[PDB]
């Protein structure tokens, strides 16, 4: 009673109605800090191998921070309108680039390593100091790295320093590996426990707090982080997390398959597909449409998506799933004249657009070919099948738990007749196709009528 | 002892991450396909309670064997890295409550070299939504 599927043979499409929405309708900034060291150049007249190892670790840190210094930033689906993803994080970083704020933040983070602070620009942020380099470089090496008496026989010193250093070393590596702008953000930028604390300490609802505290595995792919500053003794870098202002809304996915007439002639065929495959999630009384499935992700029953690849479509667009011909909303489709075979993957099955003469088949691992189709839009579930072959592609079927419904109906392609139809339409719709057909009929008849 | 504890806690954060990440022009008409159907389907077959005990029993002696899952399609499984040994019979008998005499430094070195593999496994699980391509060598040497 949570997820299921229904496939309409009326226009040859599948609907997976079980997933629960997770829309990042808000952003959230958090400036993390790591207390650096303006180390004075090391100096030991006389080389012990442990001393050389300590020197090499310090020099590796120095190359890390030199790198960081130099990197301180010194088919429908084509009308969405792109957006500046990194605007908020780099805007906060810019707010930091004003001279005074860094001392304020450092003072606010002197005692603890987590605090809510108000920047110069008014919007409150939450900041961390996860790794402290000043302590373990000042009061653990300098008192024991004296000029001449470089007695560092304790080997484990270098091991502790390396374990407390590799985190920031990978931070600088990722700064230099992703143009200072990376997604996902690795744990060396924010430890998972630190992430849980951040989610628990930020201003969102308790249900959303639990929701985003236990759902890390997708957030990183919906998160971002650019460098802010090394201004004074500290490495400060912003993180951009989501804020689910829309939750607990039942939203679904739409998969598409061509309809065609099935004349024995391989050529002169007429084919129609629904060009609206993607995601529909309900937020504010109208659906949110993601055209390209590369902007949405799946987690069991929670689908996590970013709305910046979304439009808001009227709720009447849902009626395009029952009657594509209704005039309430002009459903979007694409027409073409090429006859070839293929199949598409729904949540619990696959739609075989078996066109031409390819030997399409549905089978299970241990049974083999159990069903053979015949030249047309057909659908098969996942229940007893996990291998559908068309031509030479052998697709698997996701074996999630659900109930499959198959609505019979005469394909609309039957209504469309050849010899008049236009053989080129991708951004077309029902209304546009009908208008063009009426225009062609009027021209043909008036040309004949005038006789 | 501090270093040993830090390594153990790093492993514990790795496995906490693993726990929390549990997953249940022409060229436009091809028809996309489910890449992860087979792997996650086999995983789901594993999520049935009984199979893991059988798999463990079949991999008790060696670290490579062909086993038949509950779903019928035979699979082949390894046990490339063994954390139970080096955490059971080579730290616990030498990590007693009070007599934490671990003067031998190379204990931590050996544990780290036998741990970093699974540490990278969990990192990649959390770096690619538990779904990555290519698979790094720490997933299969």
């Amino acid at each position: 009673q949570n997820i299921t599927e229904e496939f309409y043979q009326s226009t040859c499409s599948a609907v997976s109605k079980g997933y629960l929405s997770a829309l990042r309708t808000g952003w959230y900034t958090s400036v993390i800090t790591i207390e650096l060291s303006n180390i004075k150049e090391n100096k030991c007249n006389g080389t012990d191998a442990k001393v050389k190892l300590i020197k090499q670790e310090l020099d590796k840190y120095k190359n890390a921070v030199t790198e960081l210094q130099l990197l301180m930033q010194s088919f429908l689906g084509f009308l969405l309108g792109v957006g500046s993803a990194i605007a908020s994080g780099v805007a906060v970083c810019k707010v930091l680039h004003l001279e005074g704020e860094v001392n304020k933040i450092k003072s606010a983070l002197l005692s603890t390593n987590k605090a809510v602070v108000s920047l110069s620009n008014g919007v409150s942020v939450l900041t961390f100091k996860v790794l402290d380099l000043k302590n373990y470089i000042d009061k653990q090496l300098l008192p024991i790295l004296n000029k001449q008496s470089c007695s560092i026989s304790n080997i484990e010193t270098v091991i502790e320093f390396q374990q407390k250093n590799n985190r920031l070393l990978e931070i600088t590596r990722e700064f230099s590996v992703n143009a200072g702008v990376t997604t996902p953000v690795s744990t060396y930028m924010l430890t998972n426990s630190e992430l849980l604390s951040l989610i628990n300490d930020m201003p969102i609802t308790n249900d959303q707090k639990k929701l985003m505290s236990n759902n890390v595995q997708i957030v990183r792919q919906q998160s971002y982080s650019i460098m802010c500053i090394i201004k004074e003794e500290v490495l400060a870098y912003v993180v951009q997390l989501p804020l689910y202002g829309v939750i607990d809304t039942p939203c679904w996915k739409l998969h598409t398959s061509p309809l065609c007439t099935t004349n024995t002639k391989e050529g002169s065929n007429i084919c129609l597909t629904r060009t609206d495959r993607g995601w529909y999630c309900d937020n504010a009384g109208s659906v949110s449409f993601f055209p390209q499935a590369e902007t949405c992700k799946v987690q069991s029953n929670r689908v996590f998506c970013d709305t910046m690849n979304s439009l808001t479509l009227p709720s009447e667009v849902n009626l395009c799933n029952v009657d594509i011909f209704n005039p309430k909303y002009d459903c979007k489709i694409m027409t073409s004249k090429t006859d070839v075979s293929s199949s598409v993957i729904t949540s619990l099955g696959a739609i075989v657009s078996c066109y031409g003469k390819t030997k399409c088949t549905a089978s299970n691992k241990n049974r083999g070919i159990i069903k053979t189709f015949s030249n047309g839009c057909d659908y098969v579930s996942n229940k007893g099948v996990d291998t559908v072959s068309v031509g030479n592609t052998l697709y698997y079927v996701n074996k999630q738990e659900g109930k499959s419904l198959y609505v019979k109906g005469e394909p609309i392609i039957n209504f469309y007749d050849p010899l008049v139809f236009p053989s080129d339409e991708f951004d077309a719709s029902i209304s546009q196709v009908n208008e063009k057909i009426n225009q062609s009929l009027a021209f043909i008849r008036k040309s004949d009528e005038l006789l | 002892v501090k270093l040993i504890k830090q390594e153990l806690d790093k492993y514990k954060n790795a496995v906490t991450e693993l726990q929390l990440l549990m997953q249940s022009f022409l060229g436009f008409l091809l028809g996309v396909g489910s890449a992860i159907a087979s792997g996650v389907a086999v995983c789901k077959v594993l999520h049935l309670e009984g199979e893991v005990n059988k798999i463990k029993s079949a991999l008790l002696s060696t670290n490579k064997a062909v086993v038949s899952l509950s779903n019928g399609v035979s699979v082949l499984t390894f046990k490339v890295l063994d954390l139970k040994n080096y955490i059971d019979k080579q730290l616990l008998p030498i990590l007693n409550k009070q007599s934490c005499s671990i003067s031998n430094i190379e204990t931590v070195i050996e544990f780290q070299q036998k741990n970093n593999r699974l540490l990278e496994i969990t990192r990649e699980f959390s770096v690619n939504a538990g779904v990555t391509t290519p698979v790094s060598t720490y997933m299969l040497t």
Partner: antibody, heavy 122, light 109 residues
């Protein structure tokens, strides 16, 4: 991986009966469930197989319609209702797990239980 | 309905001997057959499935071969625990499923 039976008894011909099957220790949720019967000192012949979900059911032709198979996920339970009993249905019954997971197209039976004897006679 | 005849109806041998049991199907089945054990006074135990794939947890002495309508079960060296009754079952692409007539196995004195 345990299966036990309850309700097994005796009744005169033409009277309804129920057999309950209780499973433990394995995925009772992902598997198709079988019932088989064997008369004492005789060979097997199939009784019925209920799909993993309880939607699709299949029966033996000689007992088609007489049997009514049900399965409850909440009670971790299977049940067989026997209506219009005949004298020749006397036998020991085994409730069994299928050999493959959540498979509409059925296979043999892998995990069986002790079995419940049912006798019918005037 | 699919009808499967098993032969011989009853059989006897001695410890260490070899036995062969045949199971014939009414109509053609590619490889869809299983061989079942049933020890005396116990629940039936599934020897092997698909007529050539053993059920793990059992000795390798049992073997299954055949195709089409005819399948064969061969035991190389009998053991006293091997007594009881052997059966064959089919799952050819659809129900109804069906069991065989039976082959009893005991020993002489």
């Amino acid at each position: 991986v345990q299966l036990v039976e309850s309700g097994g008894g005796v009744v005169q011909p033409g009277r309804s009966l129920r057999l309950s099957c209780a499973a433990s220790g394995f995925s009772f949720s992902h598997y198709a469930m079988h019932w088989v019967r064997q008369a004492p000192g005789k060979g097997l012949e199939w009784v019925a197989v209920i799909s993993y979900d309880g939607e699709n059911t299949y029966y033996a032709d000689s007992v088609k319609g007489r049997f009514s198979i049900s399965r409850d996920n909440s009670k971790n339970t299977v049940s067989l209702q026997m209506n219009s009993l005949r004298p020749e249905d006397t036998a020991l019954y085994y409730c069994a797990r299928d050999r493959i997971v959540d498979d509409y197209y059925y296979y043999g039976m892998d995990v069986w239980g002790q079995g419940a004897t049912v006798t019918v006679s005037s | 309905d699919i009808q499967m005849t098993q032969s011989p109806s009853s059989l006897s041998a001695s410890v260490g001997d070899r036995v062969t049991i045949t199971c014939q199907a009414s109509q053609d089945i590619k490889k869809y057959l299983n061989w079942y054990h049933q020890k005396p006074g116990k629940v039936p135990e599934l020897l092997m499935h698909d007529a050539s794939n053993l059920e793990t947890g059992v000795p390798s002495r049992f073997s299954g071969r055949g195709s089409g309508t005819d399948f064969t079960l061969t035991i190389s060296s009998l053991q006293p625990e091997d007594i009881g009754t052997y059966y064959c079952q089919q799952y050819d692409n659809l129900p109804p499923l069906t069991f065989g007539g039976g082959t009893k196995v005991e020993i002489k004195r």
